[PDB]
GROMACS .gro file of N, CA and C in nm:
model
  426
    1UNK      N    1  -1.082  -0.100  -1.691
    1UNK     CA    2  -1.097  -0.120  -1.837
    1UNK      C    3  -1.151   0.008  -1.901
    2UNK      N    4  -1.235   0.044  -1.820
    2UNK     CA    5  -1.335   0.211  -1.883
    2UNK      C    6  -1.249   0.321  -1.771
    3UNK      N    7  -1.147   0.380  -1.792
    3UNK     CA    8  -1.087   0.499  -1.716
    3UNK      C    9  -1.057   0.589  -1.802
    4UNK      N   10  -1.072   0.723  -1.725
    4UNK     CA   11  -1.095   0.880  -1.776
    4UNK      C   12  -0.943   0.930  -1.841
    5UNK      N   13  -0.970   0.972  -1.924
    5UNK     CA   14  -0.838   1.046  -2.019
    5UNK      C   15  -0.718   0.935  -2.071
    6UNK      N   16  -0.632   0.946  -1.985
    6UNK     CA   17  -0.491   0.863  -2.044
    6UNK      C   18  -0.457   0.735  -1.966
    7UNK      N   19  -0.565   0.708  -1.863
    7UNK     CA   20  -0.503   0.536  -1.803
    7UNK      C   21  -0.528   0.503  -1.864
    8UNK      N   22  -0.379   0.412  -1.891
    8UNK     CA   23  -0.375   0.292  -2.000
    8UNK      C   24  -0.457   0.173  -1.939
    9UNK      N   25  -0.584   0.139  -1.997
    9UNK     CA   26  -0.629   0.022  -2.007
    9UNK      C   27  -0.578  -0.107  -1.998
   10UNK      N   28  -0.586  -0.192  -1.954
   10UNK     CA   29  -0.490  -0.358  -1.935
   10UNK      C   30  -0.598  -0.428  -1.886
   11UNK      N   31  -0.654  -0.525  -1.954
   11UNK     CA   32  -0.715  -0.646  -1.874
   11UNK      C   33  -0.837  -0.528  -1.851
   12UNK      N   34  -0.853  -0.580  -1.691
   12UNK     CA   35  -0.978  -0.483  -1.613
   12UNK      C   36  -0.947  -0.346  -1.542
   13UNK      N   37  -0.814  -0.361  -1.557
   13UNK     CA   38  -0.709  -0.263  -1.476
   13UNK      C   39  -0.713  -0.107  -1.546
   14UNK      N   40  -0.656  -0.017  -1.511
   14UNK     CA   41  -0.583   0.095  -1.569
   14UNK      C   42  -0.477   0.157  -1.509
   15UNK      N   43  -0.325   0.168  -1.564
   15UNK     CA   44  -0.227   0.202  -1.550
   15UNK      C   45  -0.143   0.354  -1.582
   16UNK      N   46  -0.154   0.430  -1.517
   16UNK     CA   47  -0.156   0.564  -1.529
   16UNK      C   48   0.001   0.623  -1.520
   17UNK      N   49   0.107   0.643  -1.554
   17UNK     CA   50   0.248   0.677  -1.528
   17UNK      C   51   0.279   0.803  -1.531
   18UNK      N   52   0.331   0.856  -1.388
   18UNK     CA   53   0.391   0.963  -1.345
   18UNK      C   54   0.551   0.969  -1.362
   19UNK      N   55   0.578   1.100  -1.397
   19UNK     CA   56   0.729   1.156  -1.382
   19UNK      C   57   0.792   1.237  -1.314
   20UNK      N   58   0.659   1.252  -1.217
   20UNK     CA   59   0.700   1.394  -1.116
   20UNK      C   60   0.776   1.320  -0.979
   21UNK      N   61   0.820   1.379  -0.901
   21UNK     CA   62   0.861   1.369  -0.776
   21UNK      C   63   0.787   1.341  -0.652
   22UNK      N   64   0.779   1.226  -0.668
   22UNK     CA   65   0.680   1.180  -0.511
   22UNK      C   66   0.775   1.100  -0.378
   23UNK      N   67   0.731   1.072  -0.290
   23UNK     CA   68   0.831   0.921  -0.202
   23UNK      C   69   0.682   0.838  -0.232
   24UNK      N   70   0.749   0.735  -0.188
   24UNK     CA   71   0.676   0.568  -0.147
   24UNK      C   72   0.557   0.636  -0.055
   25UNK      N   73   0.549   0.724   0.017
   25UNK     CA   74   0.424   0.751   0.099
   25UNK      C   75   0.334   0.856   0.011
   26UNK      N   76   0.395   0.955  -0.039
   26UNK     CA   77   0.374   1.010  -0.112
   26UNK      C   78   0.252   1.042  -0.226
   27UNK      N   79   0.338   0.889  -0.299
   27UNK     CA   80   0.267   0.823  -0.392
   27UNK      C   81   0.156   0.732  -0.359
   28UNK      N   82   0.169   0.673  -0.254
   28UNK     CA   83   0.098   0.568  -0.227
   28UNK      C   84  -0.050   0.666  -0.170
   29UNK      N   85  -0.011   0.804  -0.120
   29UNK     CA   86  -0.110   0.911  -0.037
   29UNK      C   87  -0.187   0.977  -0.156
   30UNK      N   88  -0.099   0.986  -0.231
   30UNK     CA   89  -0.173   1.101  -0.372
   30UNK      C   90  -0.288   0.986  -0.466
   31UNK      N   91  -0.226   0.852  -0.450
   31UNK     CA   92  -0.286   0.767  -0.484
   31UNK      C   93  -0.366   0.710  -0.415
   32UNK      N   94  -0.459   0.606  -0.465
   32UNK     CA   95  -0.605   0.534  -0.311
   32UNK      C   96  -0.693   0.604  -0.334
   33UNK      N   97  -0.675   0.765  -0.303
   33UNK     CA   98  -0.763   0.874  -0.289
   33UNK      C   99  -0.847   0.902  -0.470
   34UNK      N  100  -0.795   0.828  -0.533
   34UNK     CA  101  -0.844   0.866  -0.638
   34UNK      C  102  -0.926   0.688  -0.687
   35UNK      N  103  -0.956   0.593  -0.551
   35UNK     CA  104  -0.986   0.485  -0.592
   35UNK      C  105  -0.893   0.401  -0.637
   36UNK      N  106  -0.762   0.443  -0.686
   36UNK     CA  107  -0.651   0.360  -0.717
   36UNK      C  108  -0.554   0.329  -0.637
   37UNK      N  109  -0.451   0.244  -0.666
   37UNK     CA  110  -0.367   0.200  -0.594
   37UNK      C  111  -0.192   0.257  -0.669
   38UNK      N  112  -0.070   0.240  -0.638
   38UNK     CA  113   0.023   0.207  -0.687
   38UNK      C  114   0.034   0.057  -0.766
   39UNK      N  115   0.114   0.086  -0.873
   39UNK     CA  116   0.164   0.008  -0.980
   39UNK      C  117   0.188  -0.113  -0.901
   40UNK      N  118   0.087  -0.231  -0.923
   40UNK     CA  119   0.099  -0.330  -0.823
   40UNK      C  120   0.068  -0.472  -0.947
   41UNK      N  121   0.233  -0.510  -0.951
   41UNK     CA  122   0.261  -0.603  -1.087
   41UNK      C  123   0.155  -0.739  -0.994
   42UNK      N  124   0.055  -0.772  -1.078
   42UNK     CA  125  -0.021  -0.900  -1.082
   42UNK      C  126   0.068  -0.961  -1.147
   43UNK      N  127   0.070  -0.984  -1.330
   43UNK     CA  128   0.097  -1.079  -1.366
   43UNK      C  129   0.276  -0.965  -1.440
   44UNK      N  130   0.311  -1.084  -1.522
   44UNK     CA  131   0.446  -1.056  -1.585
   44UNK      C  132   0.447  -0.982  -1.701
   45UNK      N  133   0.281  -0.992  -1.724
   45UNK     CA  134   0.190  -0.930  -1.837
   45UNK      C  135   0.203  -0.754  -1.788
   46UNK      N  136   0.173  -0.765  -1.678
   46UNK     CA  137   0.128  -0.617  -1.585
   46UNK      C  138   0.285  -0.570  -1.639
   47UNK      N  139   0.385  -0.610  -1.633
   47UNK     CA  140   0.529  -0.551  -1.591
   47UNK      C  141   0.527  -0.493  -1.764
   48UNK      N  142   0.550  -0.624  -1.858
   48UNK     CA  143   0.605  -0.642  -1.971
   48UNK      C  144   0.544  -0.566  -2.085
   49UNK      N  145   0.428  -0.504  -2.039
   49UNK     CA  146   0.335  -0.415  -2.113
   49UNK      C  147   0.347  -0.282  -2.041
   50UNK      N  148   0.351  -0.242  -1.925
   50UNK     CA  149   0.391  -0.131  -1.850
   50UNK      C  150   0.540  -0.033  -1.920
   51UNK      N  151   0.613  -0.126  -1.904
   51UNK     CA  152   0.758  -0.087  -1.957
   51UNK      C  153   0.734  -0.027  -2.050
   52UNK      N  154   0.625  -0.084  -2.138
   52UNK     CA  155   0.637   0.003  -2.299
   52UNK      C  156   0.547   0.130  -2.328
   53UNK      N  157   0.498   0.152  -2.231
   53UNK     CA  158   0.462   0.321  -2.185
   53UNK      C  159   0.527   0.377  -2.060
   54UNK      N  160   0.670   0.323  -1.985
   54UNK     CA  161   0.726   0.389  -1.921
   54UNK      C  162   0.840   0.415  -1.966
   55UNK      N  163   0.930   0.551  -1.991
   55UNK     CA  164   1.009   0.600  -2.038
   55UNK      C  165   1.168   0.530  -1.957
   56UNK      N  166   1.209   0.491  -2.074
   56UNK     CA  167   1.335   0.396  -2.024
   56UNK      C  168   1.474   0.503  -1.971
   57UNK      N  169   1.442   0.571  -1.853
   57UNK     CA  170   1.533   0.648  -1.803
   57UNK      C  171   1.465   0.690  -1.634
   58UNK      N  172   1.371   0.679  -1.635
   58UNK     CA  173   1.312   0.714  -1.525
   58UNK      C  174   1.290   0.564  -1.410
   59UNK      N  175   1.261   0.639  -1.286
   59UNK     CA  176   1.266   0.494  -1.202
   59UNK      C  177   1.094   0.535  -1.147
   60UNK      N  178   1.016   0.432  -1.178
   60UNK     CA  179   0.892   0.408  -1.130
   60UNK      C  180   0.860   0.299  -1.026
   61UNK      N  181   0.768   0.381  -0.897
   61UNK     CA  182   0.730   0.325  -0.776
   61UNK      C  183   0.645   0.201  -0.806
   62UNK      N  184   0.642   0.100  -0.737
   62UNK     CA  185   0.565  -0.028  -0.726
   62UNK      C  186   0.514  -0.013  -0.627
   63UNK      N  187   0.397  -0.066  -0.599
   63UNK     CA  188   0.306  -0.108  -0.513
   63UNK      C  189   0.340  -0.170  -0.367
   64UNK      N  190   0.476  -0.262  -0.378
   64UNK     CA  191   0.545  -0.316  -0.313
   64UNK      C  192   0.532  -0.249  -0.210
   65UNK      N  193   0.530  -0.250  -0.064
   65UNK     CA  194   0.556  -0.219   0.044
   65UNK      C  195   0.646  -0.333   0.162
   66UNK      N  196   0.735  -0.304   0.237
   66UNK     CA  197   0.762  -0.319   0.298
   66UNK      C  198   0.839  -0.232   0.432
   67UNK      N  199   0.768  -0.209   0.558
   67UNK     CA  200   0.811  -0.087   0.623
   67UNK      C  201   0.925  -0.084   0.710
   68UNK      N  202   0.999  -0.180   0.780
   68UNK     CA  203   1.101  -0.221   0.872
   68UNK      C  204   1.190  -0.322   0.817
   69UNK      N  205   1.236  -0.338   0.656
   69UNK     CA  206   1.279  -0.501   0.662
   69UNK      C  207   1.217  -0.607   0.691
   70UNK      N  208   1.092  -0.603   0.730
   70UNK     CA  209   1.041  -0.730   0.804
   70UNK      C  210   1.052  -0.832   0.721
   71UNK      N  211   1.040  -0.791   0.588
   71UNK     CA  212   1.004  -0.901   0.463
   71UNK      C  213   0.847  -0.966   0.459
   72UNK      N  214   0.800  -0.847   0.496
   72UNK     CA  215   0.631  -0.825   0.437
   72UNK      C  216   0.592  -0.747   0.331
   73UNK      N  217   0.667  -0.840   0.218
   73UNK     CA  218   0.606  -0.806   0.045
   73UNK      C  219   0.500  -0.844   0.044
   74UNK      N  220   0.414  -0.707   0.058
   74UNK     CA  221   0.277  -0.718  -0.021
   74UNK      C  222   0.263  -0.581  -0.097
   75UNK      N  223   0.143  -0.622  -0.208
   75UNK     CA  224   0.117  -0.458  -0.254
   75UNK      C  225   0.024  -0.432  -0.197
   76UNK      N  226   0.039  -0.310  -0.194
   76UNK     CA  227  -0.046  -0.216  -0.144
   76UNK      C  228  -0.185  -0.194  -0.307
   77UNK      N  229  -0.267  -0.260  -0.265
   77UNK     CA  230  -0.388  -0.320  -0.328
   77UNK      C  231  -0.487  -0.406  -0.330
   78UNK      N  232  -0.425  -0.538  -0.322
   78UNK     CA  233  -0.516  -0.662  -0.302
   78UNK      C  234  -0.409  -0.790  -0.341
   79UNK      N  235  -0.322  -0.751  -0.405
   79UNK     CA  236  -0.210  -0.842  -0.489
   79UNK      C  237  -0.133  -0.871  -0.364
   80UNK      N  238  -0.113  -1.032  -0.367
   80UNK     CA  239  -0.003  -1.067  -0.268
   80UNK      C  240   0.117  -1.085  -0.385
   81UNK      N  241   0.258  -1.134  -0.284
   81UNK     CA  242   0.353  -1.104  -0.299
   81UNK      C  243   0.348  -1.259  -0.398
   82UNK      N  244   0.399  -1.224  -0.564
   82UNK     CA  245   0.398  -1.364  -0.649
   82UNK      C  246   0.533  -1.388  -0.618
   83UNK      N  247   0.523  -1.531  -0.574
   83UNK     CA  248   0.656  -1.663  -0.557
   83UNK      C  249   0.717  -1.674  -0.731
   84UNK      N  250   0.641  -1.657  -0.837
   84UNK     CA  251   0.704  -1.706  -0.926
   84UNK      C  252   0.714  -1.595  -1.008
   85UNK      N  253   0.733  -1.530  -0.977
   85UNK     CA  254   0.754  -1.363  -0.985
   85UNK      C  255   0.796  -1.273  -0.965
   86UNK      N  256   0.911  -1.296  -0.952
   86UNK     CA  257   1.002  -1.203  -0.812
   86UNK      C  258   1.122  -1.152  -0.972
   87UNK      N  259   1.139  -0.997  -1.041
   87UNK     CA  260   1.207  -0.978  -1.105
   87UNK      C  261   1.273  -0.850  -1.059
   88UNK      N  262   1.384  -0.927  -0.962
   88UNK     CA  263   1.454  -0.835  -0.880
   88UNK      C  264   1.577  -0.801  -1.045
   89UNK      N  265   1.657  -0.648  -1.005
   89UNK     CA  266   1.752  -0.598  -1.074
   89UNK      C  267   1.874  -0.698  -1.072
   90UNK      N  268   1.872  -0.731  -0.951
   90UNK     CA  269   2.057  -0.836  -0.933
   90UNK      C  270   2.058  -0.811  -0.746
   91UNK      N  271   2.211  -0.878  -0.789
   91UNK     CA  272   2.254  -0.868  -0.636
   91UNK      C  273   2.292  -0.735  -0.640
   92UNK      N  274   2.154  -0.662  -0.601
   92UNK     CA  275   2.177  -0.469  -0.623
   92UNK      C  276   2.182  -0.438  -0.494
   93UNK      N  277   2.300  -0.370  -0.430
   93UNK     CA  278   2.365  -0.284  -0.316
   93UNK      C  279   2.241  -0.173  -0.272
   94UNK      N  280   2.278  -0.120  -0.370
   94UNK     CA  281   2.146   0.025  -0.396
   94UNK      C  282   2.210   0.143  -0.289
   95UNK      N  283   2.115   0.117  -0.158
   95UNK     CA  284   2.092   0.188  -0.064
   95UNK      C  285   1.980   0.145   0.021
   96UNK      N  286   1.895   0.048  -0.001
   96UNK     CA  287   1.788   0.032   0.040
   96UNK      C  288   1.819  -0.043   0.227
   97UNK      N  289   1.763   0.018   0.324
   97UNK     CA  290   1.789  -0.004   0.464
   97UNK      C  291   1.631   0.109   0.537
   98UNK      N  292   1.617   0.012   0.619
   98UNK     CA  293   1.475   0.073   0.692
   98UNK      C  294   1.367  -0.029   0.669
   99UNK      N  295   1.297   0.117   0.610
   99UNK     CA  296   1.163   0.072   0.494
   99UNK      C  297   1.238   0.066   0.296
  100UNK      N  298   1.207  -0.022   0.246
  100UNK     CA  299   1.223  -0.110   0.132
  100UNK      C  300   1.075  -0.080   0.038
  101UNK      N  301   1.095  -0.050  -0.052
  101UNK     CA  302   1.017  -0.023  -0.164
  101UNK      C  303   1.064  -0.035  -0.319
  102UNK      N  304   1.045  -0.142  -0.383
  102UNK     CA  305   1.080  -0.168  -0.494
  102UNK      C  306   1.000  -0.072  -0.633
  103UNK      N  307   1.059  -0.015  -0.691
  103UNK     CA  308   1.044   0.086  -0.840
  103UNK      C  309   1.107  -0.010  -0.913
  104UNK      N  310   1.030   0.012  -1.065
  104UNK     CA  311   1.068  -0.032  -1.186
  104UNK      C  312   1.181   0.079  -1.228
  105UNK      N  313   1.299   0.010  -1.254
  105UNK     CA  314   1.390   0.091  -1.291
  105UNK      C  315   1.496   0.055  -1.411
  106UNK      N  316   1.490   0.154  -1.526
  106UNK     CA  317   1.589   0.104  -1.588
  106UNK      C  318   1.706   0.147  -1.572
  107UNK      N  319   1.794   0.039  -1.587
  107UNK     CA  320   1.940   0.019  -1.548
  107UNK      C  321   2.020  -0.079  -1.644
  108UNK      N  322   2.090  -0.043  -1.672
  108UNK     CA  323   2.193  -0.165  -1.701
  108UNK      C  324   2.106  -0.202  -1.836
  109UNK      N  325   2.002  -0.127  -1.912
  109UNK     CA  326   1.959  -0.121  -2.005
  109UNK      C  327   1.850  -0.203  -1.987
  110UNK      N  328   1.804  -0.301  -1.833
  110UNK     CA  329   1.711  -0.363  -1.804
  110UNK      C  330   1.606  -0.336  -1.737
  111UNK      N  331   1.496  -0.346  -1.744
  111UNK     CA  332   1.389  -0.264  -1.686
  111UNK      C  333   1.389  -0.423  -1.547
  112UNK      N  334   1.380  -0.376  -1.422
  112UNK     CA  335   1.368  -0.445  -1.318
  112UNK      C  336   1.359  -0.418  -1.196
  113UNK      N  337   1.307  -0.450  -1.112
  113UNK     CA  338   1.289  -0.419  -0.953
  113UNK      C  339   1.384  -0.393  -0.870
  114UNK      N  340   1.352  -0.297  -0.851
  114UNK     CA  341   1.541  -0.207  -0.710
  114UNK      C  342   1.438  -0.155  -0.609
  115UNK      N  343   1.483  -0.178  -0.523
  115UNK     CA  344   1.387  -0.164  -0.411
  115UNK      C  345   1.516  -0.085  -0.317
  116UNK      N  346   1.419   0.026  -0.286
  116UNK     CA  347   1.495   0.159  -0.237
  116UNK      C  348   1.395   0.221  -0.093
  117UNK      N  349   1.487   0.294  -0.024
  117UNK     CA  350   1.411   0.392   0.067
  117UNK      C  351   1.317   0.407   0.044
  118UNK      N  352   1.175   0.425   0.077
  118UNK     CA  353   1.038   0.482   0.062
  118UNK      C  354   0.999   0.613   0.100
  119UNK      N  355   1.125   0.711   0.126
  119UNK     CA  356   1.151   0.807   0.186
  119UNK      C  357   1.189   0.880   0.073
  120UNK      N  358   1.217   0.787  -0.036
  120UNK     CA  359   1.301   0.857  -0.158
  120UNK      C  360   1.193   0.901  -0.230
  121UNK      N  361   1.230   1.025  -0.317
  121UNK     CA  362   1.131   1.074  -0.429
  121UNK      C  363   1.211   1.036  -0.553
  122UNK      N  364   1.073   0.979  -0.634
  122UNK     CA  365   1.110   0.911  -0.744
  122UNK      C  366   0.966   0.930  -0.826
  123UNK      N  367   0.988   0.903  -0.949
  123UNK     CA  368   0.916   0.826  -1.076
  123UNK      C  369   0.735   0.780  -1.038
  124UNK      N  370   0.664   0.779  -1.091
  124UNK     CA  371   0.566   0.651  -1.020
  124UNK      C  372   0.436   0.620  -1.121
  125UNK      N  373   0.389   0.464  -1.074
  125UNK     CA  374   0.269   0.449  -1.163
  125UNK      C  375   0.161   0.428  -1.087
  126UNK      N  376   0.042   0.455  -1.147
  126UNK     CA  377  -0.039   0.513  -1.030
  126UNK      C  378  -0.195   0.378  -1.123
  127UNK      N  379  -0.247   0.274  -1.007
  127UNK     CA  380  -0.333   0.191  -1.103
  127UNK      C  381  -0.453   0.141  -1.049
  128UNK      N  382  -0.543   0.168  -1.146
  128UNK     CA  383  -0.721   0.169  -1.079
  128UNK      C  384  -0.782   0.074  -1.139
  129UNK      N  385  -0.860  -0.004  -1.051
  129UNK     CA  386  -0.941  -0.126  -1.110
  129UNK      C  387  -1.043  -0.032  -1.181
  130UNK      N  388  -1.123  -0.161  -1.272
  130UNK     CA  389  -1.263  -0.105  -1.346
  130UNK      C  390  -1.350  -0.083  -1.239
  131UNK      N  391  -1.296   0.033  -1.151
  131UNK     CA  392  -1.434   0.045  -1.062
  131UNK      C  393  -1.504   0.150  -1.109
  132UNK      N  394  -1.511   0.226  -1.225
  132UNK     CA  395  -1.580   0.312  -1.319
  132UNK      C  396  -1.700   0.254  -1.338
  133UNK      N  397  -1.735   0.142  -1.334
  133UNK     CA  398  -1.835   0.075  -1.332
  133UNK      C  399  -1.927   0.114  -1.213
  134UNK      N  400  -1.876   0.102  -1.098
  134UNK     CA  401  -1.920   0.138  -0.933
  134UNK      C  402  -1.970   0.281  -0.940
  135UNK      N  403  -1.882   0.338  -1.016
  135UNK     CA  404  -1.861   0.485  -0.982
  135UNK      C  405  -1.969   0.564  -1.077
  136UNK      N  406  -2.095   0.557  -1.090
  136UNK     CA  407  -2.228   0.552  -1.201
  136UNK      C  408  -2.283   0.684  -1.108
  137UNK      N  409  -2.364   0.641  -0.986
  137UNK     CA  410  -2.420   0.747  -0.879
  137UNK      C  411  -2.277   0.781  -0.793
  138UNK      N  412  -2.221   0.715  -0.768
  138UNK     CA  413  -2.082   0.742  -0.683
  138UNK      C  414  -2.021   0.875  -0.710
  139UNK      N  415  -2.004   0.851  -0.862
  139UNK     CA  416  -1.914   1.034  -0.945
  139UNK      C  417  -1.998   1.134  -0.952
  140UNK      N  418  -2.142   1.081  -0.991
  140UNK     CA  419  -2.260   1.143  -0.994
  140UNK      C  420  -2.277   1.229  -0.848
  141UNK      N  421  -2.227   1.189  -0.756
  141UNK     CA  422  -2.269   1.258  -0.645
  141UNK      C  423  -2.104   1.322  -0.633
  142UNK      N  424  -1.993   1.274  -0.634
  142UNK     CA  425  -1.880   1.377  -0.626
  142UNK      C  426  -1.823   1.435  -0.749
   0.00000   0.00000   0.00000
């Protein structure tokens, strides 16, 4: 809720959007380290408010992980995988085989989940709880 410069604020959250070139490890590596996680849709709220500070041409990383196909959707955060929540692109071909990582992507003029290589460099949103709160003596000392 209280984050430094341009994370967008949401709820307790802050949502930060990249345009540079990362992969799924990448991002997920450049991220954590800063206390945050990848763009890891909680609610439909998280998505539907996101979109409107992410530039409708670019494809942005989700939180989503899955490393072998196994079909272990979770984010990489604390967020399990929502049942009533699932806003996949379509019956999308893509390319996605291996490891599976779903980005917000617009397409087809629709902003929605395509889940691609994690190997791929792409787009990404980068998102930190209110742990600014925690972080009092914590920053104070780094």
């Amino acid at each position: 809720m209280v984050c430094p410069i341009d994370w967008r604020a949401f709820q307790s959250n802050c949502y930060f959007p990249l345009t540079d070139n990362k992969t799924w490890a990448e991002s997920e590596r450049n991220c954590s380290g800063m206390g945050a996680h990848l763009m890891t849709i909680s609610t439909e709220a998280e998505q539907n408010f996101i979109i409107q500070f992410l530039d409708r041409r670019l494809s942005y990383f989700l939180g989503l992980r899955d490393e072998n196909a196994k079909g272990q959707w979770r984010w990489v955060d604390q967020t399990p995988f929502n049942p009533r929540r699932v806003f996949w692109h379509k019956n999308e071909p893509d390319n996605s085989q291996g490891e599976n990582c779903v980005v917000l992507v617009y397409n087809q003029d629709k902003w929605a989940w395509n889940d691609v290589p994690c190997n791929f460099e792409a787009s990404r949103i980068c998102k930190i709880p209110g742990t600014t709160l925690n972080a009092e003596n914590l920053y104070f000392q780094s």
